[PDB]
Design a protein around this ligand. Structure first.
Ligand SMILES: Nc1ncnc2c1ncn2[C@@H]1O[C@H](COP(=O)(O)OP(=O)(O)O)[C@@H](O)[C@H]1O
Ligand SMILES: Nc1ncnc2c1ncn2[C@@H]1O[C@H](COP(=O)(O)OP(=O)(O)O)[C@@H](O)[C@H]1O
Ligand SMILES: [Mg+2]
Ligand SMILES: [Mg+2]
Ligand SMILES: [Mg+2]
Ligand SMILES: [Mg+2]
Lengths: 593, 598
């Protein structure tokens, strides 16, 4: 049958169809996958029958490496175990069956659902294998022979050149299960590289015909770093580890956020004005799927991969990674590798298209040359997604009508805004000074403040208010508490405890940014580095010391973007010091296989 | 200014609109799925202000003055229930910013009373915000509508209204601190007495008093004849104050039931008590999450008389009696009643049409009923509400007309796809089909030789949007009673219920009731003297039981009379009476004319 024709149904009545964002398959606002791939079927099956889902993956074979499932109704996280083909642990109905990449399933690998177990066979349901209508009421696509001998179960596939990895069961019983796959240190090494110097960057290599690249130059000049002929590389294996961690930590952060918002004692730790709490909760409940983009900061090298923080509120660097660096490669890279942030623009337009933003969105940026290209970069994504826009620089163009409605300069109503401003800046206006958030709805001089916009109930804001929770460092000790000793986490606390004193630690303000007010204390007493900034008075958290690697004279940090909650790209930042700050450079990154 | 024009904003940016009135569905005001009130009344503003700024709301009330008797607020984000205290005007407890301020009915606020929000305290005064008082644009930026003088005399605070003929009851603060607060009012027993009454016999009902040209009434007659009870000239009455109490109880218990439902669906230990097939658990939860606001109607069963008001159960899944109370009794009144009272269920059909209009049912609704003539008029009554709301429908009697296409889609007789279903069947009947049969999913068919479609093949098809939603089996299962008792111990309207006969129950006597039964089946009433007062047979003798504190119906004019109230969209939608010669009301008990009298 053609594309999308109904071929049959798997148990419980889950359709099986024959097999850029018109291909997204959703149930309510829960993403199932890309029509009509094998993963989309497996996730939809689990969603409709058991209310759980597995995290976004690039290819089906990667599913076998996952060790958790997300229970959609409460954002809970469940254990998922993996068993190798030939296991004493029988493959029960409902289990995920995973194929490694290879043969019939060349680069992708494959995934199916086991529907029934017999004595010498098993029936499974799947998408993207069978493309013809199944017979009346038959709720399985293929039967695979099973050999039970000496208590061990082995499945034999119908293709002569495939490799079945095993099956996965949602259970706490670890017996017979395999440990989580850990990447070998060496594949995570960041290494330096050089371009042949033929003078590719000895002039105006950035196109001043492009308004966007022009805005960048006006704020930075024709420069990315101290030596544009030098770049770094990472293995494709490393990129996949980054993608995995990004997708997992994002879910881990959302789970801790839910926990925080369900408990006043945990919420009090964030130092957000109490008058906002009910609103934080409302935002969490109704804008849960509305986060557009964020950035995670990681330390990556032979030692493994650890997250320092997650900039979920107002993340930048997009332009540099998804545009300036594309121009850089285009201008001087003749290699086989690729810029892992190449599709950022498109990914973002995708998020905006499936968001519930109003047709016209006002973009709010500070009157600051550096913010001009960021605001215009997002405007291009909004335009590609079909929205009309207007850029507000500063707050002077804003005023109120007689009734107290918000209007812009051309006289239109402002009811939807994407901002570059951090929510914390608005919280400051509350703390400077009631039965409600004290916002003005009229002024003799028509003086509109930041909070008078962002907290007007009728204004639809992006990023949503709840994002101040995962973007506040007070969440780190909570994440450590919920997932103690997790491979990607660093032990962090609200005090310098016994183990921390033993490991050395970083002191970081909970609502800071740009590498401000950071103190790095070695496992001795010595202060490795300390920075200044305006956040020295806020509460701090203490995070296990885990210093950036030094490669070719610079400390290099890896950053990944989330867009709509999934990996959207990678970029590097480098600094002469251990602490990355707003003025650290963007370093060209090439992923090589 | 005109009706609906923005006059300004209260603190936090909550708009205040003009309510000058010079399908009322356009009149309902929501924020997302939350009902705030009627545009643009004082109650609508109060609730919208509390929802927007604090994420809480108070239940539906008939009049504003009634808010003062409330003792809880609902937290929207988790269906949690918060304590609310009332303080009289002149109390030591000061009227803080954010507090509700209630006026009794009287003077400028005639019979509705009034409600406002206190926005700020000034030692000698207080500013407040409200909606149905001033209808003109407020000064630019001013976020309050009126100032009231406040006098502070010896630790106490008293407010004086700007009108000379009004009465301020006091203010309410969401706190667990009870100091200085009022005890929740309780109605006087005598006011809850149900009285017998009689019409003059002039032959009004001696012939064909039900109009047989009206399909609905005709369908009623084909099942029951031109009869409602044994003596159509006799009726019962209750006071307007007893009805206000029923309205109040109904709204409160519905939320208590939804709160217990949430708690059950969060804990596997509690859910296992319901004896529902494990394979459905994930679905039950999905339903509660997605269909939270889609319940259309339910019926609560109460014992009411001078001892008070107690609830026996809540038929949340498949309830009937709508046709009787809202149509047949309307015809009865029109035909023989010439007094000043009214049928408390007279607006049922309109209430129902409104719920459907705001539901998210698909454009075409298939009505599924069993082949019982008694179910014909019930299916047709609901079809009338559906039609009134703009939906197209087709009634399916039994499952014979159903079949699947080549791939396995569900179609009706005329071949149209079955997408939306309002059923008359109980969910437990489908649950039984599962019990009859380890699968990896609900074992439904999507193809068969004979094209034999079972009930579950329709109701548990993912693509079929069914009403009532699946989650309603929880509040309709009597396993929820001990849970509810556990959550609200000694609550005013609740009866002590357990899964065993405990010490307190032996002392009071108790009713033994199957958790998934209906219609008075397999009920055992046992006295404190340890004597069986009554037993009914039936088909549910094998399931788990709950034991509920004995509280027998009152006997009035020869019959035990039970009070039932309908819920429509989560709020009170009417009241009706059922009477029997025995203590246990059954499917065959009759409907008794009821008139609310002022
Ligand atoms: N635990 C840590 N160990 C070593 N260096 C750290 C640690 N945490 C942070 N740093 C350094 O400080 C910089 C700032 O910390 P980060 O958590 O990203 O906060 P922000 O960038 O919001 O100020 C990092 O980019 C890194 O160079
Ligand atoms: N605790 C109780 N004390 C006295 N009578 C009761 C009690 N519970 C139920 N009954 C009687 O039994 C009838 C049936 O019980 P009910 O709870 O309504 O279950 P159902 O109608 O679903 O079978 C009631 O209408 C009432 O007459
Ligand atoms: Mg950082
Ligand atoms: Mg940061
Ligand atoms: Mg009953
Ligand atoms: Mg019942």
């Amino acid at each position: 049958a053609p594309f999308g024709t109904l071929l049959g149904y798997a148990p419980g009545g889950v359709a099986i169809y024959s097999s850029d964002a018109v291909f997204r398959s959703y149930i309510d606002d829960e993403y199932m996958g890309h029509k009509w791939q094998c993963v989309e079927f497996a996730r939809r099956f689990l969603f409709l029958n058991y209310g759980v889902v597995f995290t976004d993956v690039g290819m089906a074979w990667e599913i076998f490496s996952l060790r958790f499932l997300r229970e959609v109704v409460n954002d809970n996280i469940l254990p998922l175990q993996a068993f190798p083909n030939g296991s004493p642990r029988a493959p029960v109905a409902g289990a995920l069956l995973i194929w490694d990449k290879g043969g019939e399933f060349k680069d992708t690998g494959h995934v199916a659902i086991i529907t029934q177990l017999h004595g010498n066979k098993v029936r499974i349901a799947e998408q993207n294998v069978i493309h013809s209508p199944l017979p009346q009421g038959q709720q399985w696509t293929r039967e695979l022979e099973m050999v039970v001998e000496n208590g061990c179960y082995t499945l034999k596939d119908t293709f002569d050149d495939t490799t079945i990895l095993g099956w996965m069961i949602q259970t706490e019983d670890t017996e017979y299960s395999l440990p989580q796959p850990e990447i070998a240190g060496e594949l995570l090494k960041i290494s330096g590289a050089r371009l042949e110097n033929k003078g590719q960057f000895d002039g105006k290599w950035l196109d001043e015909k492009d308004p966007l690249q022009n805005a960048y130059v006006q704020a930075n000049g024709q420069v990315i770093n101290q030596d544009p002929y030098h770049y770094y590389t990472i293995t494709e294996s490393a990129e996949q580890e980054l993608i995995k961690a990004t997708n997992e930590l994002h879910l881990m952060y959302l789970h801790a956020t839910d926990k925080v918002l369900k408990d006043d004692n945990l919420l009090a730790l964030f130092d957000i004005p109490k008058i906002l709490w009910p609103r934080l909760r409302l935002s969490w409940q109704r804008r849960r799927h509305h986060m557009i983009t964020g950035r995670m900061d990681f330390c990556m090298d032979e030692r493994g991969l650890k997250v320092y923080e997650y900039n979920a509120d107002s993340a930048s660097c997009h332009t540099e990674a998804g545009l300036i660096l594309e121009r850089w490669a285009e201008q001087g890279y003749k290699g086989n590798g690729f810029n892992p942030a190449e599709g950022l623009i498109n990914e973002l337009a995708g998020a905006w298209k499936h968001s519930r933003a109003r047709p016209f969105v006002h973009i709010m940026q500070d009157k600051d040359i550096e913010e001009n290209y960021h605001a215009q970069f997002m405007e291009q994504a909004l335009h590609q997604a079909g929205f009309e826009t207007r850029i507000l620089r500063g707050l002077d163009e804003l005023g109120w009508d007689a009734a107290g409605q918000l209007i812009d300069g051309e006289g239109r109503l402002v009811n939807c805004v994407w901002k570059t401003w951090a929510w914390e800046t608005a919280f400051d206006q509350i703390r400077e000074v009631f039965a409600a958030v004290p916002i003005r709805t009229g002024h003799p001089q028509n003086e509109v403040r930041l909070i008078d916009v962002l907290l007007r109930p009728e204004v639809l804001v992006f990023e949503p208010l709840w994002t101040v929770i995962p973007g506040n460092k007070a969440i780190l000790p909570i994440l450590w508490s919920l997932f103690p000793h997790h491979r990607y986490l660093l032990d962090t606390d609200f005090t310098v405890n016994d183990e921390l004193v033993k490991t050395g630690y970083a002191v970081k303000p909970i609502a800071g940014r740009c590498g401000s007010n950071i103190d790095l204390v070695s496992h001795h007493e010595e202060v490795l580095d300390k920075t200044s900034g305006k956040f020295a008075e806020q509460k701090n958290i203490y995070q296990q010391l885990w210093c950036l690697p030094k490669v070719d004279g610079k400390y290099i940090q890896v950053c990944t973007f989330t867009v709509g909650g999934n990996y959207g790209g990678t970029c590097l930042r480098g600094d002469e010091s251990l602490v990355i700050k707003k003025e650290s450079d963007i370093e060209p990154l090439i992923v090589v296989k």
